[PDB]
Amino acid sequence: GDKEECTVPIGWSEPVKGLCKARFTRYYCMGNCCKVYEGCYTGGYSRMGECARNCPG
**Cα–Cα distance for residue pair 46/15, rounded to 1 Å:** 17
Q: Are 28 and 38 in contact (CB under 8 A)?
A: no
Which one, of 44, 35, 42, lies nearest residue 16 by Cα? 35
Question: What CATH architecture is 22-57?
Answer: Irregular (4.10)
Q: Which long-range contacts (CB under 8 A, 24 or more apart) does 4-7 make?
A: 6/31, 6/32, 6/33, 6/57, 7/33, 7/35
**Cα–Cα distance for residue pair 52/28, rounded to 1 Å:** 9
Which one, of 42, 40, 9, lies nearest residue 25 by Cα? 40
Method used to determine the 3D structure: NMR
| DSSP bridge pairs for 5 | none
